[PDB]
Design a protein around this nucleic acid. Structure first.
Ligand SMILES: [K+]
Ligand SMILES: [K+]
Ligand SMILES: [K+]
Ligand SMILES: [K+]
Ligand SMILES: [K+]
Ligand SMILES: [Mg+2]
Ligand SMILES: [Mg+2]
Ligand SMILES: [Mg+2]
Ligand SMILES: [Mg+2]
Ligand SMILES: [Mg+2]
Ligand SMILES: [Mg+2]
Ligand SMILES: [Mg+2]
Ligand SMILES: [Mg+2]
Ligand SMILES: [Mg+2]
Ligand SMILES: [Mg+2]
Ligand SMILES: [Mg+2]
Ligand SMILES: [Mg+2]
Ligand SMILES: [Mg+2]
Ligand SMILES: [Mg+2]
Ligand SMILES: [Mg+2]
Ligand SMILES: [Mg+2]
Ligand SMILES: [Mg+2]
Ligand SMILES: [Mg+2]
Ligand SMILES: [Mg+2]
Ligand SMILES: [Mg+2]
Ligand SMILES: [Mg+2]
Ligand SMILES: [Mg+2]
Ligand SMILES: [Mg+2]
Ligand SMILES: [Mg+2]
Ligand SMILES: [Mg+2]
Ligand SMILES: [Mg+2]
Ligand SMILES: [Mg+2]
Ligand SMILES: [Mg+2]
Ligand SMILES: [Mg+2]
Ligand SMILES: [Mg+2]
Ligand SMILES: [Mg+2]
Ligand SMILES: [Mg+2]
Ligand SMILES: [Mg+2]
Ligand SMILES: [Mg+2]
Ligand SMILES: [Mg+2]
Ligand SMILES: [Mg+2]
Ligand SMILES: [Mg+2]
Ligand SMILES: [Mg+2]
Ligand SMILES: [Mg+2]
Ligand SMILES: [Mg+2]
Ligand code: NA
Ligand code: NA
Ligand code: NA
Ligand code: NA
Ligand code: NA
Ligand code: NA
Ligand code: NA
Ligand code: NA
Ligand code: NA
Ligand code: NA
Ligand code: NA
Ligand code: NA
Lengths: 49, 50, 122
RNA sequence: CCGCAGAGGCCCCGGGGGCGAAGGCGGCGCGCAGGCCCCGCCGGACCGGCCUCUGGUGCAGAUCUCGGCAGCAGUAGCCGCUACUCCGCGCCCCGGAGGACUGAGGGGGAGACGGGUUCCGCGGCGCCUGCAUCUGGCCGCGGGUGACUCGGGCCUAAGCGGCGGGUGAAGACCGGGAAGGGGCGUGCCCGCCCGUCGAACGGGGAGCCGGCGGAGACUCCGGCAGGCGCGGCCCCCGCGGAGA
RNA sequence: GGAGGCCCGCCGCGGUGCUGACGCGCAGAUCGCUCGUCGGAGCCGGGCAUGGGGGCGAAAGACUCAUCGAACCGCCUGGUAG
RNA sequence: GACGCCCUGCGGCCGCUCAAAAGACCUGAACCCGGCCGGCCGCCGGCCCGCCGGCCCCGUCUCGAAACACGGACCGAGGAGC
RNA sequence: CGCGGCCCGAGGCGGCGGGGGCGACGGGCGGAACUUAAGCAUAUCAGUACGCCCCGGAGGAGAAACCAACCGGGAUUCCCCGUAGCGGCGAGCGACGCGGGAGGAGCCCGCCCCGAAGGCGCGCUGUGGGGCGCACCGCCGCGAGGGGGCCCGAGGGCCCCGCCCGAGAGGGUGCAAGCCCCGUACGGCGGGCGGCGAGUAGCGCUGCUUGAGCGUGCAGCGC
RNA sequence: AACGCCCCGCCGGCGGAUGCCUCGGCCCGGGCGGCGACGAAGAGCGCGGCGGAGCGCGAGACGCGGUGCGGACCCGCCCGCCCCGAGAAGCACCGGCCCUCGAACGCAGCGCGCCCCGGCGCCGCCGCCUCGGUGCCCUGC
């Protein structure tokens, strides 16, 4: 139950085995799509201005 | 054993429901070459560790 | 096959609620028919349509409710977090554009007496 | 100098190719040699002579690496646990008859842990059942675990964690001296200071009989009881004995 | 009358001798006879504690998951070699 | 993967589709092996072809290897001065 | 024995923030040994591996308590160029200036004057204002030009004669296809005065670090 | 002798080299540089007409709705669509749904509380409400 995850640089194979991108990555995919081709930037510009 | 928690019981339940072959109409719908499911297990040979 | 949201948006909340009740009841009936006896083509055909019909009605109800609630908090200072503008965490926690352009008064005075001009050489 | 893979050029109407390329097998010829060429059969879509350029460029060995495979050889072996036979029907399945064994610290009847569907019915022999198989814990298709009273959920043991804080570059580790909660019911009264962590064997409020299925039973059904709560109606603030 | 780190002896717990069997094993330590002990410094199950130059030891450099005169896993590391 | 014919069933023959069986599959080498057909022991040389003459097992370290010095059952592919 | 102000504390409520993830690049700490020296202990490997903490689209650095010694330059960063020195003075290690380029940009607070003029439930234990005298990306589209004969299971093959070209990049099609199909070339739309920082700088002793050598930088304690 | 063994001329096995081919790798350049208490990355368990693995999705589950474009199919068996719009396959953007664990938030990990109306985690900043002090004072008594 440590708050942080157990990661060590002396084994890049275990990092390879479990890490970001080895699952679905639903929210990140949606946000990246809305940014590269979408209206997230226009919304941000309107909100800031 | 006969005295288990519900949490262990639910994980073993999924293993049993998944130990199935590829249906016959699926093999021909997808034009499959390899017709066996190599994620099956047998109780006398496996170690589920669950 | 099935209902259309088009003519669904033209009913009141009570009517939609009753419609949903009937759809769920007959979905239970179709589940019973599948579980017992045998799956004749007509009831199995009706099954998928009924499932998507329940989906459509729930969609309409929620959209109507959201529109009403959003109209309830149109001009308040603090609104529910589900109605605030869609941004990322990082751009939410950021200075606006005019806050970035603020200058102390002395620098403002200096930058007005020497404005940028257009010129050419030769 | 011979050969291998690739790059830049040439190959006199624009190099050779389904009228058959690469590769494989057999046979001539040429060269001191490394090698090259041609012919026949197989094969079924690519190939390269000369000039300049480039390199992960030539194997008999390394108790070399990976793959395949021989002799040995129908050889070594199929020695614990006393044992099977006749007929239906087959040394091994089922039935009847006979003959034996385990020998109540059981080759019996049941649980804990571990396993996880191996359980039951129907069908089957492609795999496995180191001989066979009509058998099966094997393969296919369908099914199967019911609780007020049994166990867990509660308690605490040895222990573990948390604790205003303390320390260390941190990660973290150590820890009584700290304005540390309730009740009734709205005002008052009481009160120094953790844990619904840790035992399917310890503590713990209360269950027996009969019967039913193919696979479940202290759980289902029938009967007869216990314990603990809640709601109505009636409904009481103690007498006897010389004493125990 | 019924004491005892008393004696014979079953299950248990051990492991003497045959230097027996086996030794391409039933088995990367087993099998058979024979043997030691058997009310105690006895034996068994579960929970918990001690962690690597450390632990634990009626002391053999023993044991610490087939690994111990310093465990195992990955990395420094394609470590250096007259 | 037609039809037909045998078969207690398992299977077999004959043929069919196709340019071709290319038949669970492109091509299909070596080692090792079965049938039929021809021969009798390896290499070099001469010859009218089984006679005569010659010939220790390679690679390696070493003054010195056929060595009772080490490595090597056999075949394929990979394999070490950039 | 009661209650008002200030000060120092306690419990609750409302609104806003924080925490975790990311084999690169970036910043800050802790910090090896194998190895080389033909042994090895200072040295080297290396201010590396690895452990811990923290951001961003970059980060960090930055407008002189600087270089220099010239007929001088002029914040920071990045590229080109090259020997002073350190060292069992062994093995080894090692900067900067001048010169040529890319890029180019400057400023504030405190102290001093006014004093609530302020962001007004805060704040005089100081809010607010001032120097005073002389002088390239995305979206949308159209897109030309070949027949005859022979022979093959099918020709993109062989022979003859043609066409298109701002298109002879390619891919597909029953065998080598500009002209069988898709594409390729050629478009449009959107975006004088006052005043300069104290347990500080520096020094003594000790530890680490550097090419820095009677000290390159840092730190502890005493002054 | 013959067999066995060992050597030529045809035919069969066993094995899988070679050649040709590859929607895959590796290097170089360019762009981008965007997660989270509004619940991330990750894990578990479910969801299809006939449904095992993988992808996807979340009790609205092998997807729902809106706006544009597109224009006949939908891998098997079925069901559906067919039309000057009546709408299959596909594509882009937008709006919602979003089970249990997880920084993981009533306690705990699969059980159990408090509360009165519904809700009940920690740390910080600002503000407010209710209070304490033989702190510095003051008044009254
Ligand atoms: K218990
Ligand atoms: K050790
Ligand atoms: K020797
Ligand atoms: K020897
Ligand atoms: K160093
Ligand atoms: Mg072909
Ligand atoms: Mg090469
Ligand atoms: Mg070889
Ligand atoms: Mg024998
Ligand atoms: Mg007997
Ligand atoms: Mg039993
Ligand atoms: Mg059975
Ligand atoms: Mg089975
Ligand atoms: Mg009980
Ligand atoms: Mg109970
Ligand atoms: Mg407990
Ligand atoms: Mg008990
Ligand atoms: Mg009862
Ligand atoms: Mg039973
Ligand atoms: Mg006694
Ligand atoms: Mg005794
Ligand atoms: Mg012996
Ligand atoms: Mg023997
Ligand atoms: Mg110690
Ligand atoms: Mg001869
Ligand atoms: Mg001779
Ligand atoms: Mg040698
Ligand atoms: Mg030697
Ligand atoms: Mg010698
Ligand atoms: Mg020799
Ligand atoms: Mg080779
Ligand atoms: Mg708060
Ligand atoms: Mg090294
Ligand atoms: Mg040395
Ligand atoms: Mg050496
Ligand atoms: Mg040494
Ligand atoms: Mg150095
Ligand atoms: Mg910066
Ligand atoms: Mg065209
Ligand atoms: Mg073409
Ligand atoms: Mg200054
Ligand atoms: Mg140094
Ligand atoms: Mg699946
Ligand atoms: Mg939770
Ligand atoms: Mg929790
Ligand atoms: Na050839
Ligand atoms: Na090579
Ligand atoms: Na009998
Ligand atoms: Na005795
Ligand atoms: Na000794
Ligand atoms: Na190594
Ligand atoms: Na081919
Ligand atoms: Na000799
Ligand atoms: Na030797
Ligand atoms: Na040997
Ligand atoms: Na953090
Ligand atoms: Na970011």
């Amino acid at each position: 139950p440590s708050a942080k995850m157990r990661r060590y640089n002396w084994s890049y194979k275990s990092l390879r085995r479990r890490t970001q991108g080895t699952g679905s990555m639903s929210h990140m995919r949606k946000v990246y799509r809305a940014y590269n081709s979408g209206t997230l930037k226009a919304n941000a510009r309107k909100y800031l201005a | 054993s006969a005295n288990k928690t519900l949490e262990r019981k639910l994980r073993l339940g999924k293993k049993i429901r998944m130990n199935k072959n590829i249906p016959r109409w699926v093999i021909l719908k997808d034009k499959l070459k390899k017709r066996w499911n190599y994620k099956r297990h047998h109780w006398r040979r496996s170690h589920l560790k669950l | 096959p099935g209902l259309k949201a088009k003519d669904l948006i033209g009913l009141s909340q009570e009517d939609l609620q009753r419609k949903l009740a009937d759809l769920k009841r007959e979905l239970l009936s179709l589940r019973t028919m599948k579980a017992t006896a045998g799956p004749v083509p007509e009831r199995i055909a009706r099954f998928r349509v009924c499932k998507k019909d329940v989906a459509r009605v729930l969609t309409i109800i929620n959209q109507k409710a959201r529109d009403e609630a959003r109209a309830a908090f149109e001009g308040a200072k603090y609104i529910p977090k589900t109605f605030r503008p869609k941004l990322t965490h990082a751009m939410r926690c950021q200075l606006t554009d005019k806050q970035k352009r603020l200058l102390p008064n002395k620098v403002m005075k200096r930058k007005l007496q020497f404005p940028k001009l257009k010129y050419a050489v030769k």
